[PDB]
Amino acid sequence: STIEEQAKTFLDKFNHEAEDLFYQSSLASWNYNTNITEENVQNMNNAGDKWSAFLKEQSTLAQMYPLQEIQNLTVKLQLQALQQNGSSVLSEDKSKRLNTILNTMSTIYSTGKVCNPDNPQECLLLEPGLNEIMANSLDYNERLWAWESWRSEVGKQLRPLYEEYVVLKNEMARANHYEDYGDYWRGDYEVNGVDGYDYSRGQLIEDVEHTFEEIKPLYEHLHAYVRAKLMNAYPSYISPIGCLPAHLLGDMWGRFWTNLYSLTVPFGQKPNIDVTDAMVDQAWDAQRIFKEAEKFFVSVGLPNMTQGFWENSMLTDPGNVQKAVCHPTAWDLGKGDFRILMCTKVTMDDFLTAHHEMGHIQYDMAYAAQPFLLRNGANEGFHEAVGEIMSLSAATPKHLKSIGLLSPDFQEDNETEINFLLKQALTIVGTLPFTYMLEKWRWMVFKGEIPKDQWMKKWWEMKREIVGVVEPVPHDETYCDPASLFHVSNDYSFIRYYTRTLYQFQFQEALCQAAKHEGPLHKCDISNSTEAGQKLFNMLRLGKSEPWTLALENVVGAKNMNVRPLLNYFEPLFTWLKDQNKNSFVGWSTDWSP
Amino acid sequence: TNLCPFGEVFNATRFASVYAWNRKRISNCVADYSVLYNSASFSTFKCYGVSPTKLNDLCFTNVYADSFVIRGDEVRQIAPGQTGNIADYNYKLPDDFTGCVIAWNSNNLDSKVGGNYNYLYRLFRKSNLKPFERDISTEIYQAGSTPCNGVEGFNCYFPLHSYGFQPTHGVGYQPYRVVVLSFELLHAPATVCG
Ligand SMILES: *[C@@H]1O[C@H](CO)[C@@H](O)[C@H](O)[C@H]1NC(C)=O
Ligand SMILES: *[C@@H]1O[C@H](CO)[C@@H](O)[C@H](O)[C@H]1NC(C)=O
Ligand SMILES: *[C@@H]1O[C@H](CO)[C@@H](O)[C@H](O)[C@H]1NC(C)=O
Ligand SMILES: *[C@@H]1O[C@H](CO)[C@@H](O)[C@H](O)[C@H]1NC(C)=O
Ligand SMILES: *[C@@H]1O[C@H](CO)[C@@H](O)[C@H](O)[C@H]1NC(C)=O
């Protein structure tokens, strides 16, 4: 009868059709991912094209349901998520050119190879060649060569491609009544039409800037201490008051700072916690690791894995016979098919990753009752944050001592948790300024607050005010340095990681304030606390049926990104860094350059 | 005198779709529910209006066995007073239901790799069904005001879809064979007892 009932019936049909076709597409992509064969590639591409064509057709048939006449909010959310026509709003010629640019970017990034200044025929790709160069070399000159060569090989190649990409994505976004493509992306955190829980797309920019402003002291202390350690590791190549070199940050592009741990560990003599030896000594295997993670999740009352998870997921590399792409991934194939694909080597890192991916799968099981369009995190940063808090809880020495992978003879003195917190901050507080800066630059580019000839001129400007990173060599505008990243090149939203980092600590503090945990936050262990488990499940089961602000308040009690949990988590480390940095100039000067 | 043919209802290989469920009538025989109760392989043996024990020592004039295949996450809808797609559009159990709903996982037979699209449920209906009334009529469903003229289009939908049953589906989406026994009493002499 009414338009609302017609839209309800339409979405009722779309739910079942999309469930079937998404199950087929994901099953084909899974069969490819476990078994890299060209026939499997054919199956995957056929099913993916079928899914994309079905999405296009359903978006078309949905656009004739006007949103302004829908009083329901879940129906409005589904219709909004389905009516966004994407690149189809553009003409065929420009859309084909855009897809060509996207595929050329993907190929240029995924196939580019850098070569030595003497052997241009035998040389190395990004992975694992440049990967190991950045993650293991302590040679300044080798890292500088790797960095400059890859920036001047893939970035320069993608620069005109990125120009066309940006200037066509602006057309695509404004054709959907968006201010830019950056606004299109921020439209994930946007909430409208809910009183007391609305969220504008500029509200996200405001909130991200505010939380980063609050972080800036802790990050700056971490950066100063790391700068002092690299002073003691590279005498003449760093200034005592300046910033850090770009190439010398443990990674190709300074996303994570983990690979500085050996060069920045607070107490090298103290034994870092590593139960991999205690795992091989008890003959632990992949099945044992995942059973331990499942038992951990049952401890907090979240349901144990379905039998299909044990049967159908690839928890171990199937030998050297068949080759597979086994980055550890969680797969919600739909219709109750939850799987994890990971080549599990018995290790503490892989133990933590098993907890991470089982957290992903547990979140996926939570909202398996929401309609198909609402089976995702409340926003893009919720799903990986729920995945990350479980690794945080499992890595704690209390859990390890309780599961029998750490002997009760182990003693916790200030040195070991300082080591733990520095590791955690190198992983986490290192990536926050980089992520925020990169997405700030990208949004400025998309909106147009930057003339094109001033991209890098501004980009390496803000490195100096935001992250504290100087360019080892000057760059002209033909460079497109950010495209050297997997996400900038391959058209991905990068602020999901900043938001994820904030929400994970908010979730952790909320859960073990509901777990009655007494003591420092970094000792937070949620195991055996069914109260925290129920608290988190109340948020998890929503999917994105309710606004992300309301879902976040369902656990934290705040409607916004609360930076306070992160600072509270790193409080012991923050105090230790303040004590340590008394004989160093905290704060970096933007003028000094290599 | 003879044993009531419950086996061929349960031993059968082809169950109907839920929208076109099979009705089989049992009468003029002595019914043994002991195997039904003690099978212990059923994942849902819920009896309404009668207890599992006393029904064996009870007389009825007619029994109806309604066979069909549904999802697992929908077996709950086979119960008096329930509401959903299966309860309202496909198969309705009355509020005063006086029979036993039996349901067992059948992921092995009724699901095959690539999908077993032979089982259909009625996704849309103009009005919810009545108790024990079958709706196999397949007129195109008109959501809006414009008539359909028997073709697919805006506000116009085919009223039947299929569970793409696969062996790797979750337990709630795994196929579940459901046999619904309904016991009836009339003024005519009872024929199902013993
Ligand atoms: C991998 O794919 C090939 C090609 O389809 C197939 O012959 C082989 O059986 C597959 N491996 C497994 C373990 O199924
Ligand atoms: C919105 O629709 C859902 C089903 O689509 C329904 O359960 C809910 O009650 C509706 N909202 C309101 C306020 O009635
Ligand atoms: C998970 O725990 C429940 C609790 O009773 C149990 O019924 C179920 O069998 C367990 N899952 C598996 C796969 O064993
Ligand atoms: C959880 O509780 C069980 C039983 O009370 C105990 O055996 C186990 O060690 C506990 N684990 C943790 C991490 O508290
Ligand atoms: C049909 O198969 C079942 C096995 O579960 C069993 O009742 C018997 O073998 C067959 N039925 C009859 C009435 O024999």
Side-chain angles (χ1 to χ4, degrees), chain A residues 66-91:
Chain A
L67 267 181
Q68 65 183 357
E69 324 185 359
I70 292 288
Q71 294 314 101
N72 199 308
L73 277 296
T74 61
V75 186
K76 188 181 291 293
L77 275 159
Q78 303 180 73
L79 286 178
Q80 188 271 328
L82 186 60
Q83 277 170 9
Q84 38 174 358
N85 44 3
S87 316
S88 66
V89 66
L90 283 197
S91 83

Side-chain angles (χ1 to χ4, degrees), chain A residues 294 304-307 310:
Chain A
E294 180 202 35
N304 46 8
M305 291 325 308
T306 56
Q307 184 178 2
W310 296 120

Side-chain angles (χ1 to χ4, degrees), chain A residues 325-328 330-337:
Chain A
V325 173
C326 65
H327 186 273
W331 286 60
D332 178 13
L333 288 86
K335 320 195 96 181
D337 201 358

Side-chain angles (χ1 to χ4, degrees), chain B residues 80-172:
Chain B
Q82 294 291 315
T83 300
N85 272 327
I86 301 299
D88 291 331
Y89 299 157
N90 294 272
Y91 184 54
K92 185 71 179 187
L93 269 187
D95 273 358
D96 73 86
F97 178 45
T98 308
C100 295
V101 166
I102 310 162
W104 65 86
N105 196 334
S106 87
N107 187 24
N108 293 317
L109 303 100
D110 303 309
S111 81
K112 66 183 288 184
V113 176
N116 179 49
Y117 302 97
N118 271 15
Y119 294 105
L120 312 161
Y121 55 108
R122 178 168 316 282
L123 192 52
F124 311 114
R125 211 175 178 274
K126 274 302 152 203
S127 56
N128 297 358
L129 265 174
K130 308 163 212 203
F132 289 153
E133 304 296 17
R134 194 167 314 114
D135 190 75
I136 62 170
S137 303
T138 174
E139 302 97 20
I140 301 299
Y141 184 74
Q142 178 211 337
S145 58
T146 187
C148 294
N149 308 123
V151 305
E152 301 305 81
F154 213 80
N155 288 322
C156 284
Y157 299 120
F158 196 51
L160 296 178
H161 292 81
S162 65
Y163 317 99
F165 279 148
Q166 295 200 43
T168 77
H169 273 7
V171 183

Side-chain angles (χ1 to χ4, degrees), chain A residues 227-275 277-298:
Chain A
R227 173 177 55 177
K229 297 315 291 172
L230 301 203
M231 181 45 58
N232 266 308
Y234 314 97
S236 88
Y237 282 170
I238 294 171
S239 45
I241 62 170
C243 301
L244 291 192
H247 70 290
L248 173 82
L249 296 174
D251 186 74
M252 186 66 204
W253 49 77
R255 169 173 182 185
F256 292 108
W257 279 4
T258 309
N259 307 318
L260 301 169
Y261 184 57
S262 72
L263 308 95
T264 60
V265 68
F267 308 101
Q269 303 314 80
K270 278 297 176 187
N272 172 270
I273 278 174
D274 187 342
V275 305
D277 298 331
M279 260 179 287
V280 308
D281 286 24
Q282 305 181 10
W284 278 35
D285 57 323
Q287 192 81 9
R288 180 54 180 279
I289 298 173
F290 281 93
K291 283 292 190 167
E292 282 288 323
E294 180 202 35
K295 191 210 309 173
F296 154 76
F297 276 101
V298 182

Side-chain angles (χ1 to χ4, degrees), chain A residues 366-396:
Chain A
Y367 54 71
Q370 306 295 334
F372 174 82
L373 285 167
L374 313 184
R375 286 171 191 175
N376 187 47
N379 77 80
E380 52 191 29
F382 267 42
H383 198 274
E384 271 280 328
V386 167
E388 267 284 348
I389 69 170
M390 311 305 188
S391 60
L392 289 180
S393 60
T396 66

Side-chain angles (χ1 to χ4, degrees), chain A residues 332-341 343-404 406-453 455-489:
Chain A
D332 178 13
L333 288 86
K335 320 195 96 181
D337 201 358
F338 313 107
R339 306 179 186 194
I340 295 170
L341 189 154
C343 294
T344 300
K345 322 302 179 190
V346 182
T347 304
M348 200 187 157
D349 288 2
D350 189 340
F351 178 68
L352 296 180
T353 306
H355 284 74
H356 187 162
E357 306 304 324
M358 191 153 308
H360 282 317
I361 290 296
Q362 191 64 254
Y363 191 6
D364 272 310
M365 310 182 36
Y367 54 71
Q370 306 295 334
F372 174 82
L373 285 167
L374 313 184
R375 286 171 191 175
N376 187 47
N379 77 80
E380 52 191 29
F382 267 42
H383 198 274
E384 271 280 328
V386 167
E388 267 284 348
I389 69 170
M390 311 305 188
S391 60
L392 289 180
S393 60
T396 66
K398 183 196 317 183
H399 195 55
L400 299 180
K401 287 194 183 182
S402 291
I403 62 178
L406 210 52
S407 43
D409 310 66
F410 193 82
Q411 183 34 260
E412 312 173 1
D413 48 10
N414 290 318
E415 275 165 90
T416 177
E417 69 275 16
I418 294 300
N419 294 332
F420 195 31
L421 283 190
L422 190 142
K423 191 76 172 179
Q424 295 300 109
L426 280 194
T427 289
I428 288 165
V429 192
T431 181
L432 279 186
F434 172 79
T435 289
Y436 156 81
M437 182 179 72
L438 185 145
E439 285 276 67
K440 198 191 213 316
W441 170 89
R442 194 185 294 174
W443 289 339
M444 293 177 70
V445 159
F446 277 166
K447 182 175 174 66
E449 293 151 290
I450 190 167
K452 74 182 171 173
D453 64 357
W455 280 3
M456 291 325 98
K457 295 162 172 201
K458 188 75 174 178
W459 162 275
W460 289 76
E461 262 167 31
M462 61 205 268
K463 283 271 204 187
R464 298 160 179 255
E465 293 83 3
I466 289 289
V467 178
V469 166
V470 296
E471 59 281 4
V473 290
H475 290 172
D476 50 356
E477 274 298 331
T478 299
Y479 275 88
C480 168
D481 281 346
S484 87
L485 182 62
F486 164 70
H487 300 83
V488 183
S489 81

